[PDB]
Amino acid sequence: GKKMVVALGGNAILSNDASAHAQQQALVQTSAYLVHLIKQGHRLIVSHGNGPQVGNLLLQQQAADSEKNPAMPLDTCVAMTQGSIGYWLSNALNQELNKAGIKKQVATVLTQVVVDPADEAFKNPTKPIGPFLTEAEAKEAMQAGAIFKEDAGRGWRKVVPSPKPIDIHEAETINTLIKNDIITISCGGGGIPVVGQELKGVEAVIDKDFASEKLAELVDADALVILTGVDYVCINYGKPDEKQLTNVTVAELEEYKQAGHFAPGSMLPKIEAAIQFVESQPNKQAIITSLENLGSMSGDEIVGTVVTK
Amino acid sequence: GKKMVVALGGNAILSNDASAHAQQQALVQTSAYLVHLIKQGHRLIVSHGNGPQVGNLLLQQQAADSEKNPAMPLDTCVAMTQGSIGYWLSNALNQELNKAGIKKQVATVLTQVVVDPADEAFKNPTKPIGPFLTEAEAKEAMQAGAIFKEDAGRGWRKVVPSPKPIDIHEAETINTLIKNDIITISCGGGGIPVVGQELKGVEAVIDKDFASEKLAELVDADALVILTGVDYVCINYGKPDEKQLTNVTVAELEEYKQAGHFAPGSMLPKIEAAIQFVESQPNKQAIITSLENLGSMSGDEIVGTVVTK
């Protein structure tokens, strides 16, 4: 079967209700779609984000911060989310696989991702985490050196450095599990950020799609699946020349970018990740589509925007 | 080389300082000793407790509890500790392996441990977690239904259900990693407690030593190593008949236990875990000694209480 890396969205897992129960229930539905891919003969390699979750955990660190109960730094918080989310996801997957009568092991591996300490991201935090706050709440929280940015008509959120992944420490272990036909969950929340050969933890949160892209390269995956809310990457949305991109090449995508398409903060990064993967090695494809859309995939019918070349 | 399961104590990781760096630093020293075993050619299989850590995390969950940032249930908290402590230990091991010039991969696997939902532990919370409180503070901590118990001369701590492990969901995966010469860390904090084929999470904290004994059986380990603060299990401490057990058999221990030796909430359980492992399969050994002794082992020779039969 074809090896595909799929990165689940942290904001998809926690779309509203922040309770463990609500998130666990969401992953139950996510798992049905993923199992569907397993039934179509595909080999699953899973990862996930943690924006909402890590921001919330951080607030808990602060709520009781004291010498007797010290707040855990961001790198350890990411590690904790690899545990909570990895548990919820692996537990949900196992339940669905059992019901379906599919004998397949699922395993979550804590993952440390190496980044460049000179990364520009460290002096320009941009990844929003935690809950949306009012301007007043944002200013009050900035007194603690924290940096906040506003999302048009949504509120303010704490932003953190989001450096680029250059290597995955446990990559060889993940490969071994894949070779033994085990469904792996790794690079949780983008991966525990570390630098140097000593793997010193740094406070940041890596973007799941770029961590996944890097993972896909290291495990020699066949396809990288980047998730969105719709079925196809759409240009000129809501305009007479609206167009849903189906099968496209890298060249075509570059042409679209040069024409000003793809929002810089949402879609552009996804397009960039897709291009990077397709240009990494021969015979590689990137699929940008919805979770629901993958749950409809029949054999090779890969609905969604498929990038090649 | 022997397959040796070593269960690290959470109270040994977080002794006097609750900060992440202090625990990371404690794990570094611990790893120096573990790497020594690896140098002898043995195959290290690691596990660890989380009493202090999960209790502190639970307090943070409580401190910010609200509909927007709800406290995570105890099973999810255990999962989170598998992440934090797993991160610290795997990072520390890598460090000490690099120092010894030994190239081996380390991997932490999230572990769900099955327990009997009818276990008496669910109507009798007994495992102490978190910080020590004064009697007065304990009383204030018991206004919402929690249960705290006293440790003579040390203080009061919250106690939770601690059922017996009956299976490890990720056993086959952990064994596959062992077969691939990867140093594994699993059953973190005793394992995420679940029940039934559905693996329904339940609120409890499993004892690392019993979780390790079960793992040892499932991966057909050669030796189960239970850690204590001393070199030999000592009986009649400070008495004309004080004896330090070196090489004992199950029959002898049951005889001692019959006499009334071993403390109910410390040594007795360790003794029981050792017995269970030795009786589980032929040619198995259980070693009760200190971490320092492990770091002084030479080949198969080690200084501590060795149980066989």
UniProtKB/Swiss-Prot annotation, chains A, B:
Inhibited by adenosine(5')pentaphospho(5')adenosine (Ap5A), Ap6A and to a much lower extent by Ap4A. GO terms for cellular component: cytosol. It is found in: Cytoplasm. GO terms for molecular function: ATP binding; carbamate kinase activity. It catalyses: hydrogencarbonate + NH4(+) + ATP = carbamoyl phosphate + ADP + H2O + H(+). The keyword Magnesium does not apply. One of its GO terms (biological process) is arginine deiminase pathway. It comes from the Bacteria. Belongs to the carbamate kinase family. Homodimer (predominantly) and homotetramer. This is Carbamate kinase 1. It comes from Enterococcus faecalis (strain ATCC 700802 / V583). The gene is arcC1.
